[PDB]
Amino acid sequence: RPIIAFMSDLGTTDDSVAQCKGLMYSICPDVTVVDVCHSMTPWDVEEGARYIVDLPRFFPEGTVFATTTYPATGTTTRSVAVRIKQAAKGGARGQWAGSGAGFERAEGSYIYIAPNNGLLTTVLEEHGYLEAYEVTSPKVIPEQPEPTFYSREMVAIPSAHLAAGFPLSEVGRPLEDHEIVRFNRPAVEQDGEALVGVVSAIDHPFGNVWTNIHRTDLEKAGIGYGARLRLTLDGVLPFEAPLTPTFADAGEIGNIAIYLNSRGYLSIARNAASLAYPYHLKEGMSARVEA
Amino acid sequence: RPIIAFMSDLGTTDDSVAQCKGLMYSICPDVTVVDVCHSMTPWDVEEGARYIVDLPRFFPEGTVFATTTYPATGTTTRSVAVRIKQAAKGGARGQWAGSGAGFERAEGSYIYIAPNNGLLTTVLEEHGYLEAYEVTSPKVIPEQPEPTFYSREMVAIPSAHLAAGFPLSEVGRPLEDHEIVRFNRPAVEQDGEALVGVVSAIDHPFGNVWTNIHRTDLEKAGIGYGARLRLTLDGVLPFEAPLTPTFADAGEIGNIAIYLNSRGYLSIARNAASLAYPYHLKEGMSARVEA
Amino acid sequence: RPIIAFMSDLGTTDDSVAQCKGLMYSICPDVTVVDVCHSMTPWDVEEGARYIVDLPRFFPEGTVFATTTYPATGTTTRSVAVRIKQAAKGGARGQWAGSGAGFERAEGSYIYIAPNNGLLTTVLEEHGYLEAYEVTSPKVIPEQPEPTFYSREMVAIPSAHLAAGFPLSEVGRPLEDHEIVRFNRPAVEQDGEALVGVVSAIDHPFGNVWTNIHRTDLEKAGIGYGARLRLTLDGVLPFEAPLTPTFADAGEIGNIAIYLNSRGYLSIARNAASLAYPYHLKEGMSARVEA
Amino acid sequence: RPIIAFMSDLGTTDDSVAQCKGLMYSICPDVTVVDVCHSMTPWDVEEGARYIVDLPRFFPEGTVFATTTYPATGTTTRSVAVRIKQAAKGGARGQWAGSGAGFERAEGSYIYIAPNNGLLTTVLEEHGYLEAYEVTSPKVIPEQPEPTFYSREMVAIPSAHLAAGFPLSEVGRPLEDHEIVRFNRPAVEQDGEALVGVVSAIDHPFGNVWTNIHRTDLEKAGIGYGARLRLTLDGVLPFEAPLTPTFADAGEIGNIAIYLNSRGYLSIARNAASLAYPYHLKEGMSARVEA
Amino acid sequence: RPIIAFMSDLGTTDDSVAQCKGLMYSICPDVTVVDVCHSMTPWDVEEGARYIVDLPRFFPEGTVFATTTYPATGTTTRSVAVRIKQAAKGGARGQWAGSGAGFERAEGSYIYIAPNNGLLTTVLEEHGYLEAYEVTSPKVIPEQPEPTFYSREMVAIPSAHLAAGFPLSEVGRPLEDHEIVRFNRPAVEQDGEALVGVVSAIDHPFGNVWTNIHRTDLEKAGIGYGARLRLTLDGVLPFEAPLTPTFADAGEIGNIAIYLNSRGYLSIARNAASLAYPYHLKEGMSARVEA
Amino acid sequence: RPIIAFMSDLGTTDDSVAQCKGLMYSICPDVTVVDVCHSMTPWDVEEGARYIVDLPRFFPEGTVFATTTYPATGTTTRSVAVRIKQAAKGGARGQWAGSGAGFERAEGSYIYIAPNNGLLTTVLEEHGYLEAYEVTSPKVIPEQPEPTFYSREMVAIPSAHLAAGFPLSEVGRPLEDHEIVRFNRPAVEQDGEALVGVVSAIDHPFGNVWTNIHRTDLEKAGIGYGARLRLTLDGVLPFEAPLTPTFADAGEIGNIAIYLNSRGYLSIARNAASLAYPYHLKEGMSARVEA
Ligand SMILES: Nc1ncnc2c1ncn2[C@@H]1O[C@H](CCl)[C@@H](O)[C@H]1O
Ligand SMILES: Nc1ncnc2c1ncn2[C@@H]1O[C@H](CCl)[C@@H](O)[C@H]1O
Ligand SMILES: Nc1ncnc2c1ncn2[C@@H]1O[C@H](CCl)[C@@H](O)[C@H]1O
Ligand SMILES: Nc1ncnc2c1ncn2[C@@H]1O[C@H](CCl)[C@@H](O)[C@H]1O
Ligand SMILES: Nc1ncnc2c1ncn2[C@@H]1O[C@H](CCl)[C@@H](O)[C@H]1O
Ligand SMILES: Nc1ncnc2c1ncn2[C@@H]1O[C@H](CCl)[C@@H](O)[C@H]1O
Ligand SMILES: [Cl-]
Ligand SMILES: [Cl-]
Ligand SMILES: [Cl-]
Ligand SMILES: [Cl-]
Ligand SMILES: [Cl-]
Ligand SMILES: [Cl-]
Ligand SMILES: [Cl-]
Ligand SMILES: [Cl-]
Ligand SMILES: [Cl-]
Ligand SMILES: [Cl-]
Ligand SMILES: [Cl-]
Ligand SMILES: [Cl-]
Ligand SMILES: [Cl-]
Ligand SMILES: [Cl-]
């Protein structure tokens, strides 16, 4: 019962994803293809990374994650396929996902295949990895790949072979760590007692505001549920509220909530109202907090 | 072959739906997850109810409907899981869906699991129910559920157990009828002999206009499939046309069609052209009809 | 392990697609339903045609393509079901799809079902057909079809019967070629030394510009990779670049690339930036190429 | 105390109008320059014509109207200067303007100067003319005119000489009527019992809708105040109201009024609310009236 | 050297204002017509009032202010003409306007003429008045006024007669105070130590934010230049800064400035950047301050 | 007959300009105020400079130019008032404006008064100056100027005294050249034989595109009035056409015209159609030209 979870920048407005899927079912007849999402900003490797980093612990062991934005499509570049180490514990407090005490995942149970353009930076950072290979074998990719469609040729197709049981180590040569491209992760800074980060994402479709300031960054500063915080955005739009577990703790609908989101990051919203949209708040805006 | 049909307000721009599906496949290996939609206006329980109310007759018996907008996420609230009675009939008459005379559905063949926030209001009304339960057992939800993600913790996860055959009656204690939250549905009022309701929906992607004025309000009002009607929208925009069963009945492409949609409601459209978009017609605009 | 690949104009904002899928699983329990896309401009049969013409080579043999925009829903019209001949080769070079040398697909191995409104024009033109039938039998359509929902009644339902192995030739009577509605598709005009055509699509979500000028058109003007081209859009934008296999060949990010897209068509783009969006280029603008 | 009333397409965002005015004061020191408007759609001679045709009765005799959109700037074309005949009566009733019984204006008492491009079509049609001359003498235009600024060179400058009392007939040679370019203005079609025309303008900033159906058209169909009308816009909006003198007659704020505008034309509006803006009604949509 | 300062909702996109002006020059040949503005939101008497209330002290004594939005155009209503008492001292601290110690204006030196719909509410409140008359005489208004153009018929025209020296008391009968329509002025409230008002206006074209909280309201609370204030808008977007005389006191470009505007009202801006526009701040938003 | 020509960033939506004009008429009873424009992007000293630099030759001698964007309003800064030397010549050659051979202007015939913030940079460059003074005397500015309104206090008021004949040399102390702030103007650079500048302006309302590439840069570059040029905008959008003196030279309506505007700068337009608006071309986009 193999699964491929598929994240691309292909969109859902034409037959691009369906072409990849027909091939995935062709190669791995028993496969289930789960869409992650296909709407990411094209070529934004950092955004793509956020949609894939936390997936492992939610999926059955043995799942393959086919994850791709491929701006270098048609170049001599080749995908990397990696077996991760730990399916972390996560959340706004960390754990295995699921009912009861959650579903514990054995180590080395998930493979990602992606362009080697840094898309997997946070996956490897958070999960570690046991082995990594360049994807080059004509057994798992086209002999004559379509130049403009490497997301199909060098990700979807080889991902189906992996799901179909093709030995990972057979895809191509091992990659040394330095050969795996990484993006730079801007660190959360300290300015006096405040923490300076950025708005990492607008949380669609709610218009919640996510920062890159993490629960661990907060607890490093003696900040926990119930602390009166001031959070400034874009350096000028400021906000004040206690840190609360969830939206409704803000009281009335529309009231500001400052909370930790399901990924453990300091976030800000309105209670059952959109914060970001009325004010055109955006990813990339400076975000500063302080108790 | 167990099915979960999944309707949420989570959107399709991030990994939120994938986290839920991952856990569904973890819990019910042989499951098939069918997306209903994930684009509903967040926290609009009335809109979400429209997308789920007439699902059962289209699905195989035993299908589990996981349906959720959860603005009370992270509070002491718990989901409700119900077995509905009649699978029923829809369109502008009431009947069974499918080829030939349609496929009859045995009573009690479908389970809905949703936040107890009135989302199931119209489902219970149209279908009735045989049993309803609070969803509390750590066999079917997390012992430590993520505060801001009850759509996953309190709907997606438990739905997967139900699809897998976990006894409904064991999810938690039984709920009395009064304990199941309902939303209020505004009635069609009378002014002279005109009926006065609202635009219940813009029917995307076509730009058709759906009213809350039902067949029954028309019938035993005098209006039948050939009546010249005057339909005024937003208190300003008047349209005139015979009541017809379909769009092409309007004749020329672009001509006004006033018809009954499949849910039996008075609707208005242009024939193979968009009515709503050019005039910027919107949900909630008043709608008035007279013969 | 039957597959229905499903392309409609139903959108993804309500339960319309889900109703169709529920019925597909009801009729063909072992079915896999693969979404192609549901976001096409309603009633734009030429656009719908673009999303379906290239599908066959990507899917396992026996796949049924349920493809539909149905502005004549509720009339006496009936759908057409056709068995295609060639699952063609049609990409930038013209090859079978998949790893190695590709998956060669047998002839006569795919069925399309669609309104008989010309939606299948390019499918038949490119692939040919072995047999075609009007879809009328109450064994595969409803005796009392919902007037406004022929995409479900006259496509989704019968596609599931076909996928379950209901004999093609039993859906209804044979259609003569002339009874199969086609739309006209203008040729590329071999103007003097130039090839004259149109922008056929904006390639979402990248903003790439696709023309209807196919590689075969380029051949016979003797135009291949390396050729210094002038591609003039909208009559006033004389873009100049060599024809290259892919985006990165243009060098700097944002630089213009002229290339052959994965459908085999002459296209223009910027390297890892959007061409169409910033300058609001649109489908239907003139496209002229020359070396 | 000479007056130039100045209507151009120059906008109010740069120094173009000021350059013209500086020159007007340089040439005719005692002049008063009255702005008509400068915001017309560039090169839309029919719109420009609407803003100037009704001016004469409002201004003191001897007023010079410098009116210009000049897309043929920098060519061999030269402007036309005309002395009109009747300063007409033309409002909802047809009267002289001002307190008491109005200011009766003598005949032959206003001069227009404009590009000879049809801008003056309705001026001549409504008022008649006594004499017309091509504007060529170096006494009133530059010997070396700025190619891209004929509105200044060939209108503003010569208008100031005219206002300073430079003899009309000395600007250049007499033009034969046929040498005076006119645009065609379609009539209201006396369709059966109805009068068929167009939306001629959206009345900014109120969003009122003006049609080209003049009170004289209404007369002779026997339509006057009190008449219950059906005014159908855009072919599909059958507005119904009595023809009333003014907006408030419609009763409640937002109620539809059908009236005669201050130019004498059949118009439709909402009482102290906007009709055109919310529903995006536009100039050029069909307009049909009938009682 | 009479002056009429003219404020209307007529806009500047057609010949409406020019019609009024031609008549003003016709009636009062020596007049200068100064535009105040013509862009006000139609029928917003409160906004119109803000554009006229502070004008007197800037203008030569004897100036007539013709000020009009006329939603009741064509009804039996008639304008009011009033001679004000004091040309106040104003500003963010109050005074006569001009060089040196300013230009002191004698009492009873200005007349406003306007519809009697409350437009003059704040004029009379701030300036007092010496006498008021209904404008009804056929010596100063048309015998047959155009129904839809009372801003011309009942304001522009009579204003020119006043400028021309027609005795004010001759316009019509005296009006008692209760016959002069007033709008309700929402008071600035106190909530603990805070002051609650509203955003009274977005200050175009800068995007500065003006409140209805006045310098006197502030100094009633012991708040003066240099006080650290918290100002919340829309109940959620908060801001912190000392009260400073001007924008540049904020330091760096873009920094928040809280200041008193030239009309003496508590305002908020960014230093040489727009505050309102990036965040879509709007008039009507709650505004609260507190030291 | 004294004239003030008035250019500001105050807009035309409130009473700001009227307050200034009121004081101008108070101080200089016989003055004529001519609006240049009031719509400039606030605080953009480069844009404001474009609207005032070529004014003098169009105006009668003795005209006072009051020109202001004042983001340093309320600081210790004071305005500068200068008498310019040559009135000069403009267009694409340099000459006098007006009928016949134009009207020559004696040297030293114009005074500008502006904030000392570089607004006059191009004025001084193009015209030279005979004398410059800091504006400080309480004879010409307020003793207590409103902090947020230096455009009125430090420009409008003093300009009116100057127009009235207040001796320039008495407004304050003389300024040395180095004390007059200038802005830096980016030069046209060379790449190969292409000239590389910027779009200096979108020429509203026509949508013409103005570059900072001047006649002189072209001349003594090889480019003359018949040269086939390639003009690339924003580094992407290419246009081709001969250099022509005007729009109609392009031939067909809509055709590309590359020309010199009146200020002598390389510009590009469509003939009697808008270039900028459909392609969303903007100020500041790079512009590159090659023969
Ligand atoms: N700002 C907000 N206020 C209240 N509820 C919110 C919210 N943002 C997301 N949710 C709710 O959280 C649930 C699980 Cl993610 C989603 O279904 C969504 O309805
Ligand atoms: N206003 C309209 N005119 C003509 N056809 C329409 C329509 N709205 C929906 N459909 C057509 O109804 C089918 C079943 Cl929902 C869809 O495929 C859509 O094409
Ligand atoms: N204009 C462009 N420049 C660079 N890369 C591009 C591109 N358009 C699509 N792709 C890349 O092509 C891959 C297969 Cl469609 C997609 O994943 C997308 O990332
Ligand atoms: N792109 C263009 N094509 C044709 N005519 C144009 C133009 N831009 C400005 N004008 C014309 O130039 C005259 C002097 Cl500025 C204005 O009245 C305007 O009509
Ligand atoms: N649709 C409408 N309803 C009510 N009043 C209206 C209106 N359109 C214009 N006016 C009013 O008519 C006056 C003369 Cl044009 C203007 O001042 C304007 O206020
Ligand atoms: N937020 C702001 N920051 C800096 N200066 C500003 C401003 N708003 C208006 N002004 C400046 O104030 C002058 C007098 Cl009203 C105007 O010309 C305008 O340039
Ligand atoms: Cl969250
Ligand atoms: Cl935006
Ligand atoms: Cl598990
Ligand atoms: Cl319902
Ligand atoms: Cl809880
Ligand atoms: Cl492409
Ligand atoms: Cl667009
Ligand atoms: Cl009107
Ligand atoms: Cl629009
Ligand atoms: Cl201010
Ligand atoms: Cl907005
Ligand atoms: Cl004075
Ligand atoms: Cl310059
Ligand atoms: Cl100071």
What does the domain layout of chain B look like in residue ranges? 1-185, 186-291
Distance F280 CA to ligand 13 centre (A): 10
Ramachandran area for residue F199 (φ above 0: left; ψ -120 to 50: alpha; else beta): beta
Q: Interior CA angle at D178 toward D176 and D179, to 5°? A: 65
Q: Is A270's Cβ below 8 Å from some Cβ in E?
A: yes
Q: Peptide bond before D138: cis, by omega within 30 degrees of 0?
A: no
Binding site for S-adenosyl-L-methionine: residue ranges of A?
9, 14-16, 70, 151, 203, 208, 262-263, 270-272
> In sequence order, which residues have a C-beta less than 8 Å from that of residue D161 and are 6 or more positions away?
D27, D28, D139, D140, D171, F99
* Dist CA D39 CA F40 (whole Å): 16
Q: Put the strands of the sheet holding C111-115 in their side by side order.
A: C32-35, C3-8, C64-68, C111-115, C79-84, C129-134
**Preceding omega of B238 cis (within 30 degrees of 0):** no
- Compute the distance between CA of residue E158 and CA of residue E23 in angstroms, rounded to an integer: 10
Q: Please, which residues have CB within 8 angstroms of residue E186's CB and are 6 or more apart in sequence?
A: E198, E212
- Rounded distance, CA B215 to CA B227, Å? 13
Residue C172 exposure: Cα atoms within 13 Å on the Cβ side: 20
Distance CA F223, CA F259 (A): 11
Class of domain F186-291: mainly beta
- Closest Cα partner for A250 from A218, A233, A284, A273? A273
Are E247 and F25 inside 8 Å of each other by CB?
Answer: no
Nearest to A237 among E254, E255, E279 (CB): E279
Distance in Å from the first CA to the final CA of chain D: 49
Distance (Å, whole) CA B154 – CA D262: 65
Cα–Cα nearest to B90, from F261, C122, A268, C16: C16
E100 vs F contacts (CB less than 8 Å):
138-139, 142-143
Which method, experimentally, gave rise to this model?
Answer: X-ray
- Chosen for mutation from A10, A12, A15, A135 (greatest number of chain C CBs closer than 10 Å) is A15
Tokens, residue C182: 């086609």
Look up residue D96 and give its DSSP letter.
-
CB contact burial D101-135 (16+ within 10 A = b; e otherwise): ebbebeeebbbbbbbbbbbbbbbbebbebeebbbb
CA distances from F139 to E138, F27, F148, F161 (A): 46, 11, 20, 8
Interchain CB distance below 8 Å, C143 and B100: yes
Considering only CA atoms, which of D18, E208, D156 is closest in space to residue F7? D18
Indicate the residue of D236, D256, D280 with minimum beta-carbon distance to B239: D236
In our burial notation (b when 16+ CB lie closer than 10 A, e otherwise), range C147-164 reads bbbbbbbbbbbbbbbbbb
Which 3 state secondary structure label does DSSP give C289? strand
Pairing of strands F80-84, F64-68: unpaired
For residue A268, give the nearest of A208, A201, A203, A187 by alpha carbon. Answer: A208
Inter-chain CB proximity B18 and A54 less than 8 Å: no
Span from the CA of C27 to the centroid of ligand 19 (angstroms): 75
Q: Please list, in sequence order, all residues whose beta carbon lies within 8 angstroms of the beta carbon of residue A272, skipping any fewer than 6 positions away.
A: A247, A248, A253, A254, B42, B43, B71
Tell me how far the alpha carbon of residue D208 lies from the centroid of ligand 14, in angstroms.
6
**Residues written for chain C:** 291
Least Cα distance to E172 among E133, E132, E142 occurs for E133
As a whole number of angstroms, the distance between CA D119 and CA D127 comes to 14
**Using alpha carbons only, what angle is made at residue E236 by residues E234 and E238, rounded to the nearest 5 degrees?**
100
- Nearest-ligand number for the alpha carbon of A270: 1
Q: Write a three-state SS string for chain B.
A: CCEEEEEECCCCCCCHHHHHHHHHHHHCCCCEEEEEECCCCCCCHHHHHHHHCCCHHHCCCCCEEEEECCCCCCCCCCCEEEEECCCCCCCCCCCCCCCECCCCCCCCCCEEEECCCCCCHHHHHHHCEEEEEECCCCCCCECCCCCCCHHHHHHHHHHHHHHHCCCHHHCCCECCHHHCCCCCCCCCEEECCEEEEEEEEEECCCCEEEEEEEHHHHCCCCCCCCCEEEEEECCCEEEEEEEECCCHHHCCCCCEEEEECCCCEEEEEECCECCHHHHCCCCCCEEEEEC
How many Å apart are CA B255 and CA B241, to the nearest integer?
9
CA–CA distance, E287 with E200 (Å, rounded to integer)? 9
Cα separation, E153 vs D102, in Å, equals 11
CB under 8 Å to C95, separation ≥6 — which residues? Answer: A142, A144, C89, C101, C102
Q: CA geometry: angle at F275 spanning F272 and F280, to 5°?
A: 150
For residues D51 and E15, the answer to whether their CB atoms sit within 8 Å is yes
D208 known ligand binder: yes
Q: Are strands B189-191 and A194-203 parallel, antiparallel or unpaired?
A: unpaired
B234 touches B243 (CB < 8 A)? no
The amino acid present at B225, given as its one-letter code, is: Y
- Nearest Cα residue to atom 15 of ligand 1: B149
Rounded to the nearest whole angstrom, what is the distance from the C-alpha of residue B260 to the centroid of ligand 2?
13
Q: What CATH class does E1-185 carry?
A: alpha beta
Are the beta carbons of A19 and C101 separated by less than 8 Å? no
Instruction: Find residue E129's DSSP bridge partners.
Output: E84
CA of E142 to the centre of ligand 5 (A): 18
Using an 8 Å Cβ cutoff, are D82 and D168 in contact?
Answer: no
Chains linked to C by 3 or more Cβ pairs within 8 Å: A, B, F
Rounded Cα gap, residues D145 and D147, in angstroms = 6
Which of C13, C43, C119 to mutate to test ligand 2, by most ligand atoms within 8 A of the CB atom?
C43
b/e sequence E23-46, b meaning 16+ C-beta within 10 Å: bbbbbbeebbbbbbbbbbebbebb
Q: How far apart are CA C48 and CA C63, in angstroms?
A: 18
In chain C, where do the E strands start and end? 3-8, 32-35, 64-68, 79-84, 111-115, 129-134, 195-203, 208-214, 228-233, 237-244, 256-260, 265-270, 286-290
Rounded CA-CA distance A127/A108 in Å is 10
Contact E272 F26 (CB under 8 A): no
Phi-psi region of C61 (alpha: psi -120 to 50; beta: other; left: phi over 0): beta
Amino acid of residue C255: N
E35: tokens are 């535009």
* Sequence-separated (6 or more) residues with CB below 8 Å from residue C59: A22, A25, A26, C3, C5, C34, C110
- Whether residue E148 lies within 8 A of chain D, CB to CB, comes out as yes
What kind and span of H or E run contains A238? strand A237-244
- What ranges make up the beta strands (E) of D9-150? 32-35, 64-68, 79-84, 111-115, 129-134
Do C69 and B205 meet the contact criterion of CB atoms below 8 Å apart? no
For chain A positions 8-47, those within 8 Å of chain B (CB to CB) are 12, 32, 34-39
Four-residue CA torsion sign, B6, B11, B12, B17: negative
Nearest C-alpha to atom 11 of ligand 6 is from which residue? F71
CA distances from B143 to A100, A102, B116, B147, D111 (A): 5, 8, 19, 12, 89
Minimal Cα distance from B151: which residue of A?
A262
- Tell which residue, F219, A73, A188, has the closest CA to residue C246: A73
Nearest chain B residue to A91 by CA distance is: B146
* Sheet strand arrangement including E111-114: E32-37, E3-8, E64-68, E111-114, E80-84, E129-134
End-to-end Cα, chain E, rounded Å? 49
Neighbours of B252 (CB within 10 A): 11
The H or E element that residue F231 is part of is: strand F228-233
Q: Is the CA virtual torsion F165, F169, F171, F177 positive or negative?
A: positive
Contacts of F277 in chain D (CB under 8 A): none
CB contact under 8 A, F280 and C275: no
Question: Do D34 and D3 contact (CB within 8 A), yes or no?
Answer: yes
Tokens of A1: 């019962």
Q: Where does C164-275 have alpha helices with state H?
A: 215-218
Of D30, D142, D147, nearest to F99 by CB-CB distance is: D142
CA A38 to chain centre: 13
Q: Which residues are near ligand 4 (CB < 6 Å)?
A: D 9-10, 16, 42-43, 68-71, 73, 148-151; F 206, 208, 247, 269-272
Instruction: Give φ, ψ of A58 to 5 degrees.
Output: -85, -20
- Residue A181 DSSP label: -
Tell which atom from ligand 2 comes closest to the C-alpha of B257.
1
B249 chain-C contacts, CB cut-off 8 A: 74
Q: Is B9 in the pocket of ligand 1 (CB under 6 A)?
A: yes
For ligand 3, atom 16, the nearest C-alpha belongs to A70
Nearest ligand 4 atom to the CA of F269 is: 1
Question: To the nearest 5 percent, what fractions of chain F are helix, strand and coil?
Answer: 20, 30, 50
- C-alpha pair distances (Å), C272 with each of A252, E120, F233: 45, 59, 18
Which chain F residues are within 8 Å of D148, Cβ to Cβ?
Answer: 245-247, 259, 261-262
Ligand nearest to the CA of A282: 8
Distance CA B249, CA B60 (A): 34
Listed in sequence order, the residues at least 6 apart from F178 whose beta carbon sits closer than 8 Å to its beta carbon are: none
**Cis status of the peptide bond prior to F205, with omega within 30 of 0:** yes
Question: Tokens 């011309």 sit at which residue?
Answer: E152
Ligand 17 centroid, distance to A280 Cα (angstroms): 10
Residues in E closer than 8 angstroms to A238, CB to CB, are 238-240
B139 touches chain A (CB under 8 A): yes
Q: Would residue F6 be called left, alpha or beta, if left means φ above 0 and alpha means ψ between -120 and 50 degrees? A: beta
F79 CA from centroid of ligand 3 (Å): 55
A82: region left, alpha or beta (phi > 0 left; psi from -120 to 50 alpha): beta
Q: How far apart are CA F85 and CA F87, in angstroms?
A: 7
How far is residue B161 from each of residues A98, B26, B227, C22, measured CA to CA in Å? 11, 10, 51, 20
SS3 category, A84: strand
Paired strand residues for B120: none
Residue D138 backbone phi and psi in degrees, to 5: -65, -10
Measured in Å, residue C181 CA sits from the centre of ligand 20 at 81
**A101–chain B nearest CA distance, Å:** 6
F261 within 8 A of F93, measured Cβ to Cβ:
no
Locus of tokens 């200034």 = F20
Q: Any residues with CB less than 8 A from the CB of A91 and at least 6 apart, and which?
A: A262, A263, A264, B146
CA distances from E152 to B277, C126, D214, E19, E120 (A): 38, 69, 21, 8, 18
Residue F222 near residue F209 (C-beta atoms within 8 A): no
What residue of B is the nearest CA neighbor of D268?
A: B236
Residue ranges of alpha helices (H) inside chain E are: 16-27, 45-50, 121-127, 150-151, 157-163, 215-219, 276-279
Please name the member of F234, F235, F239 whose beta carbon is closest to the beta carbon of C236.
F239
In this structure, the residues whose C-beta lies within 6 A of any atom of ligand 3 are A 8-10, 42-43, 68-71, 73, 148-151; C 206, 208, 247, 269-272
- The answer to whether C91 faces chain A, any CB pair under 8 Å, is yes
How far is it, in rounded angstroms, from Cα B110 to Cα C13? 23
F162 sits in which H/E element: helix F157-164
Task: Tell me if chain D has a CB within 8 Å of the CB of B191.
Answer: no
CA A218 distance to own-chain centroid:
21
How do C208-214 and C195-203 pair as beta strands? Answer: antiparallel
The Cα angle at residue F131 between residues F130 and F134, in degrees rounded to 5 = 160
From A203, A206, A208, A267, give the residue whose CB has the most ligand 1 atoms within 8 Å, as the site to mutate: A206
Question: Residue E213: what residue type?
Answer: I
Beta bridge partners of D243: D258
> F154 by DSSP, 3-state: which?
helix
Is the separation of the CB atoms in D38 and D10 below 8 Å? yes
Burial class (CB in 10 A: 0-12, 13-18, 19+), B281: buried
Residues 6+ apart with CB under 8 A from E242: E225, E226, E227, E228, E229, E249, E258
